[PDB]
């Protein structure tokens, strides 16, 4: 099984219960065409990298 | 503890020889061990296979049911069984502010292949029409449906089972209805949408080899 990366290309606001999950449009580093939407815990500026432990799950948008 | 997928022999299923594509694909059945024979095992199977899989460059919204009537040793000889229109095109044609006109007939060929043909047809908005609702009155529907029954029984009673499938591969029946029923009320999406073989005569392999030769 792989552990993959993804760079933050655009921020999409803030979700969760208490307003804690940042919804983010991430771009993969295998294909620079393949994008998914991801929920992130913790402070995120636009143009940093995340470690995806499963590269399959795509989150519920709004 | 045993391995079930060792006793599985593959057979290349072949469409009848009135098509452009012959090999449909592979089917597996168990090896002929003891009582249960393989040559009686894969002999009752239907393959719902689209027209894009059978003709050169056709439409993908018409599926043919094909039954295997013979196993010639690593070769199935598939006979014409039925025909169906896909969920997609059938559900795309049915829209509000127009009249849907269905017909059915129970008619046999020159050989004893008793079929059941279903027709559908929808009313057209004219190329300058301003009025929205665009319906047909009951005596206009009854005359269209009467001619739908007439053309279906006409163009199936004349000829045998090859010549009616070759009338369904290009939809020569549905275009006769769309042009014949113009001077009652102009129709736009007219299809023989389902054909359902009811009765079938005693099997002769000599004349299945005509459909596979």
């Amino acid at each position: 099984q792989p552990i993959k990366l993804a760079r933050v290309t655009k921020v999409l606001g803030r979700t969760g219960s208490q307003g804690q999950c940042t919804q983010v449009r991430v771009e993969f580093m295998d294909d620079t065409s393949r994008s998914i939407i991801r929920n992130v815990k913790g402070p995120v500026r636009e143009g940093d990298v995340l470690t995806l432990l499963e590269s399959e799950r795509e989150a519920r948008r709004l | 503890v045993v391995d079930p997928f060792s006793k599985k022999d593959w057979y290349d299923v072949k469409a009848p020889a009135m098509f452009n594509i012959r090999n449909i694909g592979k089917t597996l059945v168990t090896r002929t061990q003891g009582t249960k024979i393989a040559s009686d095992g894969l002999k009752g199977r239907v393959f719902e296979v689209s027209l894009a899989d059978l003709q050169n460059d056709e439409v993908a919204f018409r599926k043919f049911k094909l039954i295997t009537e013979d196993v010639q040793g690593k070769n199935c000889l598939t006979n014409f069984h039925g025909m169906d229109l896909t969920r997609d095109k059938m559900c795309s044609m049915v829209k509000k502010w127009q009249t849907m006109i269905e017909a059915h007939v129970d008619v046999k060929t020159t050989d004893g292949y008793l079929l059941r043909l279903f027709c559908v047809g929808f009313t057209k908005k004219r190329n300058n029409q301003i009025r929205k609702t665009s319906y047909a009155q009951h005596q206009q529907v009854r005359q269209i449906r009467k001619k739908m029954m007439e053309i279906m029984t006409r163009e199936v009673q004349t000829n045998d089972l090859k010549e009616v499938v070759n009338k369904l591969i290009p939809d020569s029946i549905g275009k006769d209805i769309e042009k014949a029923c113009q001077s009652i009320y102009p129709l736009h999406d007219v299809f023989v949408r389902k054909v359902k073989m009811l009765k079938k005569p005693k099997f002769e392999l000599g004349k299945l080899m005509e459909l596979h030769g």
């Binding site: 399959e56 799950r57 795509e58 | 997928f5 060792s6 599985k8 593959w10 299923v13 449909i24 694909g25 592979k26 089917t27 597996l28 059945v29 894969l42 199977r45 239907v46 393959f47 296979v49 689209s50 894009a52 993908a60 896909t86 969920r87 997609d88």
Partner: protein
Amino acid sequence: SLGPQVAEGENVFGVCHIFASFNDTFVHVTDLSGKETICRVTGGMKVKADRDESSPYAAMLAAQDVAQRCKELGITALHIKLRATGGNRTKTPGPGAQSALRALARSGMKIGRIEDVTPIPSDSTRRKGGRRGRRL
């Protein structure tokens, strides 16, 4: 496991009956006939929670084991046949259809012609619920 097929200009086609209801997901794979089957893996064989047999996580594990199993016997393309609960119940495919279909192709499978074959009743029998329905 035994296939005499050359890997030159062939895709050998199975048929994937994906029945995504609102409490489970079936990723059933057959031959072209439908009769002889290869592999079916459900959402409830991947989680130990009756809650999450529905889940979109479990439905992608079902397709990952289906695609692992289908490669060993040697079926490399799929005719998808999507399905809901149907009858006088809901025609909406459940919340783990798009997980079981995403995860199929990305496990090295080839997608053929697709169709939504939910059993639509032309004039059904009386629906379970009663006149005033389900009062939550």
